[PDB]
């Protein structure tokens, strides 16, 4: 009868195995919404998506819409405090986050069950009435400011960006999207424009109800979240808005057949080929493009790629269709090129067209699309449980593009086969529709051209008709064939019945020196799943730098080899995931059980006989110099932590030691290398899903077999399972360890506050203390002092120590930033003793929430657990005795375990701190600092420095 | 012109290279002089010895003339406090000891050189009016039968005595030397025998003035030594006593081709071959015995040993004369068997006797003689310098054998090349009359016999006379060859001028990625000599029990290799050390330098291109594992040494451990790991003697270049130089742990009290506090309470870590020889605020002798260099730096030191300690504390595991 609603759907189709319930339905004022209720969720959450986005941003005031998403959360009207909304959450153990894309503005949250109502509203005052407060406006610009320059120097922008300014530049596909100080202040002063109006502007005319969908999850009946709904949500204005759309291509004729060379700032080497395509979208019923993609983009015997591996010209490739806007879309092939490929190009892209020609002669497959149709069916019919706030999200986004009932199969099911559609797609991928761009190194000082934005160093090019010719001709080449059947399809989806001796927790079931076996069979989601985990312990994994790189290229050899054979079992729903551990190895199987021991004996038995192929081992090798060589020109927040973690573990081999050894592996060598590492090992295994107790001691029964057969693997002794120590800092302590980072010109810190040993005491003493900072740091270092737009604090824990730690990337120095930190600290312990009791059993109740907050997903449950097995710590209680004690700590346990560990001149403060300089480089009262220690030598640090104890068990 | 002295002797010789000053004299009562002059000693010595023996033992109380030796320490007339001499040397850096042979009892101390009077006039009294007070005697009883108690399960004693009790039972070589309770207290009261007269009676008839000798070494002129001499010793009696001689050889012929077979304690296999001889003593001149021992004995190229070595039977061989008594003496050919060897027995004597009577067809060789000759003739002349302790010692047993003028060259120089002595003794050497033992395993249960004092089981038979003809029928074999011309007989002595910019301590004039070198040229003895030490750091030597098993492997299969070779040089006065460490491999090469670079060559040389000789790969392996076994039969208190290190050090492998990962090395895997650890290497070195800066340059480069060339050697990372850590133990923690030694029916103990890092401070605390407990503890512990033989306590120091620590192997248990120690510990306590101000100040300067004690030999400065240098610290000015702060404490600074550090319940104190238990195991006394709750260690990991580690020390 409710006038404030247009339409209800009620039956919103959803996977057999979903449990939780969902409506549809449409509001007077046009808004979309979907409505789930699931009465366990621990969380509740909501999301809106608004169908206007970047590519609406007025031309001359870029980044707009951008700039409208951060300045939606500090104050609406009748929630006018600045961080109001972003303090709620976190006293009542929520968070929240936004995006812009070119035609979306996305805005979600997630908050305690309990109260969805107030969280709600506060979020729903985001498209009814902003502040913009003017003094706000001034102070959020450099945020995005601060944002941008995080991206100025990285690769994947600077791409993003060039191919946008390579286009039409007409088309609004042409802007800036992100943003930054000088188009969304300088510039828009000088032109005598007023930012905070054209904010209001854009908001009042883009932000219309019959352009937003919504999604509110939570445990309340479907007929009471509607009313809510309907309460907060009916008042948004509908100005009607008409739905934008870009029906003419920003590659036209003039922007085809044209060549790029492109600077990159690390070392990497790629090519890229794109191909202007029309909208597919309202094709999603068939998809076309995901089906070119899945074949273009195959790995299987006889793919584009395992050819162009074969010829050793590349490593990876990525095909498929790439999202654009309404009215064009992209196709692209982008390889990755070793040594050899980058003097191929022209070749590696005839081999392109040759496979591309292959599909052509063949015609469209149905049994393949039928395959992709079945195993959708299977992946939709037994889909993880999803995180509230993601799925709310997600959700919210399709909304638009699906009516109510069809948006939980949308992306997923494919229906109908349209072979008409696929020949008309596969007739845009021709040689006279390609845009061509080489990123490399060895284009230094031979470019001619920059792009404004990143300052992109980059040559254009017309491709010679003689090459596109030879192209165009491009017969059929032989060995390039389809994919056959993929063979690793489960067949067996039955749950096993629940056991009489199964247990809650996992159980060690299996104790032998050669190994150590943990069980649970999967009780909460039944699922034909399993998640099966090891860890491989031998000491020769980590003894030096030169074994840790045989270590690492080892495995990336038998990753690439396996990968063939992998990759369609990949496909399947059945993946696994092998790399090395300073302890020894890490393997772990995933998905589901039916063929999963297929796997795992061909992973065990391939890495145990493993013989390598030596133009493979030189180019991974290659690739891995690179790769190390890098990571100088990674962020400087990363670089912090970086150091850190050098700084304070026992053992630990820096990069520039492990590229020194690494011009020193030989062929030969590596060859000696794993017989010797397979020689002694000890294993400690979680699987956990649905298997059964005999069924498991079978699994871990072949790993051992095939180990001991093809390996003659021994038992390791228990003297040599050694996990490593943390440093212990003294007392007063205060050190200080300075790099430069040569990349980025923002610098960055990592500040840290060793506090002692896990404890159930300790733990929750520092775990509370940073919950309560944690939303005031943000608001203080970020929101009101502006440093940077990245701003972390919270709990630090390695080898079973703890502490606080403090990360901000900024534009100022750091030797100022300590000041801040320092100044805020105590702003919060005046501001802690100032601050109710009631205002405290909030926060209690906020992390007990967060800390009990169930799995919702195997994978998930599989985490915690694993997480409890390789800290060597095994309580997989945790989460209640830990809680529990929580909610007995006064108001002034904290204060004392501050002033005490934390506080300028507490007794027992252990503080070292890392400071990375930008490329150039030499308000709350700020206390007196001590005059800390200047650390020249990382490894003489550690050594006059005592070591931890290691936890007990 | 003077009455108390007979003779003045004459002028004695010398090393020209000698700068201390001889004179030899006789006194009138007969004692036998010689007295050195050295103004530059720190320490002063004297020595006496008295030409009686446990041979001359009473038959009825056997172990008398040991037992006497250890009274005349307990007091004497003018100084009756029981510990007086004991406790003087103490306080005055001094410290004692005596021994008795068959034939000699031999007393010798040092002290501070400006007490040398004071510590002599206390000596003397040992021979003039000792009490041997009845309460003394009943208590250091004890301490000898818990002296014999030590021996009774080590297999060289065992034998030792086993031979003694197979010859002539009514000969005097026959008799039980060391002596225990029951001969020395149980049976003599049994007897009615009354020791203590006994004693006085023995002591009265044997100790007579014509029966001693006397040295005495002081910075006094030789006048002033003089007077000082016969001033206190021209007091002692002359009864005049004929000098007991042993004509009668104990091995008659009922002796003679005779076998026995043995079963040993530990598993070892083991060959004796023996022959009778007579005395050769007085033809020292030519010495026959050296020069046939020098033959049958070579390693060299054509040897006896040589060929036993490639048959696989033997592995290592000792021969030459054996000492015995005045009138008898051996000739011993000694082997150690494989597995094969044991079953290749007779073989291998037939073999011997082949190599003899090569020996006997080619006549004694002059030129052999003029090589021995000429080697002893160098090595007297450039001769180290000798610490006075053990130097008059030496002198003072062979001023019995040589005229005053040839005591100092008597062992030394050879005049007289003798065909005919060389010729006569090598006719003894003939199988009609041989005596045969083998020590096996094997012979378990199998034996017959029961050996009294030590129980040794033995089984006795005669050799059948087809295998003695068959040995007498030895054919010349054509394998053996005499060794050819010495050619690494140095030539070259000459000392090279001291170099512009030479330094008091060792330069670091060599500091690259690859190699750290420290050097010095020798300022101060200025022998033709040099010491050049190498420490390989390689982190895959102790990676895994494994890998350190292999490390040892390998370098003791390079050293068996190269000792045909090497032991040429070896005998020219150049040698080689190389063994591995926890953390790669050291390698020493010391002696001549002049053809010193050669040697070193050739080691590096053959390290670097190694092949493996898989006969001898298997064999060694064989052994080693024996080795890691026979651990279990060492003494308990090595027991608990051991455990103690290996708990408190971060990471160390134990003898299971190795075992186990020891039957899994093969022939191919460890010449796969021998490239692998030459791959990367640092080296740090001290390059210390007669040589240049530029010739040391040289020395380090070759061996850098031999790597890099023939084994491809890059530098470590920096960072992968790790040294590891001490174990931090917690405030106020007391742990126990506890194990059974299965052999020795004696308990052992060690008690660690943990203290902290070092540091100046902290050292001199230590070292002052451990001076000052250092006697006390002695004669608390082992002369008062009697709790064992062996009782030490003192600095312990590892890892730059460092605390006090006593070790205690005794016949009570581990858990009340704690309760005595803590006992002791109150009782300092007491003492240090009892002590006076005057008395404290003893101690300090003692400390400060002690420390500032100057080195005499190259050899040793090297050690004190090399010390600073594995340790990390490279403090070379250590000695002065320290004293001087430790000359400003206070008695204080101790009391408060030791009441948070080491008090019963001291705020900081940390207490760890090993018991280890006998075979079969769980008053008028000061009162011992109330002990804490100790936590018992169960897991030598798990504890590591759950405890901090101590931070490394800072170098400079
Ligand atoms: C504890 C806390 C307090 C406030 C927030 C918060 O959402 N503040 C407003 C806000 C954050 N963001 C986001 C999304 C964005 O880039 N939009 O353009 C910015 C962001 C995202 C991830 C971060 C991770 C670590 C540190 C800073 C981050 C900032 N957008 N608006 C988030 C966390
Ligand atoms: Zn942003
Ligand atoms: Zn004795």
């Given at each position: 009868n409710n006038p404030a609603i247009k339409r209800i759907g009620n039956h919103i189709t959803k996977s057999p195995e979903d449990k939780r319930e969902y409506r549809g339905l449409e509001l007077a004022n046009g808004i979309k919404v979907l409505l789930i209720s699931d009465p366990t969720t621990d969380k509740s959450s909501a999301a809106l998506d608004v169908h206007i986005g970047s590519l609406s941003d007025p031309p001359n005031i870029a980044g707009l819409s951008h700039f409208l998403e951060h300045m939606l959360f500090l104050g609406t009207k009748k929630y006018p405090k600045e961080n109001e909304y972003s303090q709620f959450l976190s006293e009542h153990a929520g968070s929240s986050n936004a995006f812009t894309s070119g035609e979306h503005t996305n805005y979600y949250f997630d908050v305690s069950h309990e109260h969805l109502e107030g969280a709600l509203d506060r979020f729903a005052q985001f498209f009814l009435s902003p502040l913009f407060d003017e003094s706000a406006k001034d102070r959020e610009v450099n945020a995005v400011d601060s944002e941008h320059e995080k991206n100025v120097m990285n690769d994947a922008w600077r791409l993003f960006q060039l191919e946008k300014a390579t286009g039409n530049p007409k088309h609004p596909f042409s802007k800036f999207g992100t943003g930054n100080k000088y188009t969304l202040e300088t510039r828009p002063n000088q032109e005598g424009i007023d930012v905070r109006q054209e904010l209001l502007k854009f908001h009042s005319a883009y932000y219309s109800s019959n352009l937003m969908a919504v999604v509110v999850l939570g445990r309340e009946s479907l007929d009471d979240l509607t009313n809510l709904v309907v309460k907060l949500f009916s008042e948004v204005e509908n100005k009607n808005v008409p739905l934008p759309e870009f029906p003419e291509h920003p590659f036209q004729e003039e922007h085809l057949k044209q060549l790029y060379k492109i600077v990159p700032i690390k070392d990497i080497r790629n090519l890229y080929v794109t191909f202007p395509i029309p909208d597919l979208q309202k094709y999603y019923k068939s998809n076309p493009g995901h089906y070119l993609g899945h074949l273009i983009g195959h790995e299987g015997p006889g793919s584009l790629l395992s050819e162009l591996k074969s010829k050793g010209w590349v490593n990876t490739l990525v095909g498929g269709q790439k999202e654009g806007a309404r009215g064009f879309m992209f196709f692209i092939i982008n390889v990755d090129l070793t040594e050899e490929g980058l003097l191929h190009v022209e070749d590696i892209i005839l081999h392109m067209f040759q496979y591309i020609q292959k599909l052509r002669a063949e015609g469209p497959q149905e049994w393949v699309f039928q395959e992709l149709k079945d195993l959708n069916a299977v992946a939709f019919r037994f889909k993880d449980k999803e995180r509230p706030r993601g799925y709310t999200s997600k959700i919210a986004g399709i909304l638009h593009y699906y009516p109510l009932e069809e948006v939980l199969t949308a992306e997923y099911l494919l229906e109908e086969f349209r072979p008409d559609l696929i020949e008309m797609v596969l007739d845009k991928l021709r040689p006279e529709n390609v845009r061509v761009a080489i990123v490399s190194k060895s284009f230094e000082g031979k470019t001619d051209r920059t792009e404004e934005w990143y300052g992109t160093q980059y040559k254009q090019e017309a491709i010679p008709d003689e090459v596109i010719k030879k192209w165009q001709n491009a017969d059929l080449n032989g060995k390039f064939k389809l994919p056959t059947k993929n063979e690793f399809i489960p067949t067996n989806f039955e749950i096993l019945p629940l056991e009489k001796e199964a247990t809650p927790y996992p159980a060690l079931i299996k104790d032998t020196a050669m190994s150590k076996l943990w069980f649970k069979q999967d009780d909460k989601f039944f699922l034909p799943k399993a998640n099966l985990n090891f860890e491989f312990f031998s000491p020769f994994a980590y003894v030096d730098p030169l074994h840790s790189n045989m270590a690492y290229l080892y495995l990336e050899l038998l990753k690439d080899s396996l990968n063939e054979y992998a990759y369609a079992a990949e496909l399947a729903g059945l993946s696994y995931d092998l790399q090395n551990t300073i302890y020894g190895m890490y393997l772990s199987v995933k998905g589901y059980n039916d063929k999963q021991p297929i796997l795992l004996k061909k992973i065990i038995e391939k890495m145990a006989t493993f013989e390598i192929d030596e133009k493979r081992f030189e180019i991974i090798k290659?690739?891995?110099?690179?790769?190390?060589?890098?990571?100088?020109?990674?962020?400087?927040?990363?670089?912090?932590?970086?150091?850190?973690?050098?700084?304070?573990?026992?053992?630990?081999?820096?990069?520039?030691?492990?590229?020194?050894?690494?011009?020193?592996?030989?062929?030969?060598?590596?060859?000696?290398?794993?017989?010797?590492?397979?020689?002694?090992?000890?294993?400690?295994?979680?699987?956990?899903?649905?298997?059964?107790?005999?069924?498991?001691?079978?699994?871990?029964?072949?790993?051992?077999?095939?180990?001991?057969?093809?390996?003659?693997?021994?038992?390791?002794?228990?003297?040599?399972?050694?996990?490593?120590?943390?440093?212990?800092?003294?007392?007063?302590?205060?050190?200080?360890?300075?790099?430069?980072?040569?990349?980025?010109?923002?610098?960055?810190?990592?500040?840290?506050?060793?506090?002692?040993?896990?404890?159930?005491?300790?733990?929750?003493?520092?775990?509370?203390?940073?919950?309560?900072?944690?939303?005031?740091?943000?608001?203080?270092?970020?929101?009101?002092?502006?440093?940077?737009?990245?701003?972390?604090?919270?709990?630090?824990?390695?080898?079973?120590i703890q502490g606080l730690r403090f990360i901000i990337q900024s534009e100022k120095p750091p030797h100022y930033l300590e000041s801040r930190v320092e100044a805020f600290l105590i702003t919060m312990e005046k501001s802690i003793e100032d601050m109710t009791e009631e205002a405290f059993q909030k926060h209690i109740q906020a992390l007990a929430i967060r800390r009990l907050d169930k799995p919702k997903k195997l994978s998930a449950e599989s985490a915690k657990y694993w997480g409890e097995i390789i800290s060597q710590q095994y309580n997989f209680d945790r989460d209640n005795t830990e809680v529990a004690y929580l909610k007995t700590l006064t108001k002034e346990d904290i204060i004392k375990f501050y002033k005490e560990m934390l506080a300028v001149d507490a007794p027992r403060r252990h503080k070292v701190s890392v400071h990375v300089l930008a490329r150039e480089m030499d308000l709350s009262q700020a206390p007196a600092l001590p005059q800390p220690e200047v650390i020249q030598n990382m490894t003489e640090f550690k050594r006059g420095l005592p070591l931890f104890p290691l936890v007990k068990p």
């Open positions: 290659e690739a891995y110099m690179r790769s190390l060589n890098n990571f100088r020109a990674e962020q400087p927040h990363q670089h912090a932590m970086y150091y850190l973690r050098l700084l304070m573990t026992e053992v630990a081999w820096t990069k520039d030691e492990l590229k020194e050894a690494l011009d020193d592996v030989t062929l030969p060598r590596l060859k000696a290398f794993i017989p010797q590492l397979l020689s002694r090992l000890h294993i400690e295994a979680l699987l956990h899903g649905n298997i059964t107790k005999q069924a498991a001691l079978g699994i871990m029964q072949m790993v051992e077999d095939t180990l001991i057969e093809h390996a003659h693997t021994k038992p390791l002794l228990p003297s040599q399972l050694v996990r490593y120590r943390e440093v212990q800092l003294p007392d007063r302590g205060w050190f200080v360890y300075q790099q430069r980072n040569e990349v980025h010109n923002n610098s960055g810190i990592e500040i840290y506050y060793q506090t002692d040993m896990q404890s159930t005491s300790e733990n929750m003493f520092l775990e509370l203390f940073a919950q309560i900072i944690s939303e005031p740091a943000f608001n203080t270092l970020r929101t009101k002092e502006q440093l940077g737009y990245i701003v972390f604090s919270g709990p630090r824990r390695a080898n079973g």
